[PDB]
Every structure is written in C-alpha cells, then in structure tokens.
Amino acid sequence: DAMIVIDGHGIIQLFSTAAERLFGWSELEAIGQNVNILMPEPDRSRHDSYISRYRTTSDPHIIGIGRIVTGKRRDGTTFPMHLSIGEMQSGGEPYFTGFVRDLTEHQQTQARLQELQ
C-alpha cells in the first residue's frame, strides 16, 4: 500500500511509489515537505503538536491502534484512509512510518448502498 517515513519533526524522508499514486505528489516533491501537506485543516496545523505531544508523554493515540482519517491529495480532493503508525530509531533520532490504505471505494459502495434504501 502507500508508505511514508518522516523524522521526529514530521518531515517526509521516504515516500513510496504507491504513495505518489495516491497522494498526487512525486517522491522528489514530497521528501522535503512536512507530512501535514497530506491532510486538511484542522489536522494540518495541528499535526506538529500531535507529534510533539507524543514525543513528550509517550502516550500513543494512534501508534499501536490505527485510525481512519481524511487525507488530502495534491489537487485538493479529500478522501478516507486507514492509517497505521510505526515507531523506529535511526542515527539516534526517532522516525515514524505510516502505512496507508485507501478507503475511498469502501466509503463509496457503503454510501451508494445506503442511498438505494
């Protein structure tokens, strides 16, 4: 599926081919950016504090739990996606990985089934 690796500051370090397809950003364009470019407001402006709160309390809200959220593509379109966050260490500093599963089709079929009674 789509995978993203960021450093302890939310800056994208690695961006898989499938993440490019899904988000609309090539790997080169993404790598120097904050991960928040992939999400809409209010999460966007709050993501850095989500990361900071975790590094300070060590209390996970998504790590080891998973969560369905709304992500944002480059063209502006938003979409539902499941997210799993993993924690890793490299060169003494923390890095996090995000495995993403696009749930757009699921949301569509569900919504479609409901509108037909």
Question: 9 among the known binding-site residues?
Answer: no
Number of residues forming the site for ligand HEM (CB under 6 A): 21
Contact between 103 and ligand HEM by CB under 6 A: the answer reads no
Among 16, 71, 75, 91, binds ligand HEM (CB under 6 A): 71
* Closest approach of ligand HEM to the CB of residue 9, in Å: 10
Residues with Cβ < 8 Å from 101, sequence gap 6 or more?
A: 1, 2, 81, 82, 83
Are the C-beta atoms of residues 63 and 86 closer than 8 Å to each other?
Answer: yes
Closer of 74 and 116 to ligand HEM (Cβ): 74
Distance CA 49, CA 82 (A): 21
Closer of 41 and 115 to ligand HEM (Cβ): 41
- The string over 66-103, giving b where at least 16 C-beta atoms fall within 10 Å of a residue's C-beta and e elsewhere, is eeebebbeeeeeebbbebbbeeeeeeeeebbebebebb
66: its two tokens: 């998973």
Residues 6-65 that bind ligand HEM (CB under 6 A): 6, 35, 38-39, 43, 47, 50-51, 54, 60-63
Query: Residues interacting with ligand HEM, by CB under 6 A?
Result: 4, 6, 35, 38-39, 43, 47, 50-51, 54, 60-63, 69, 71, 83, 85, 96-98
Binding positions for heme: 47
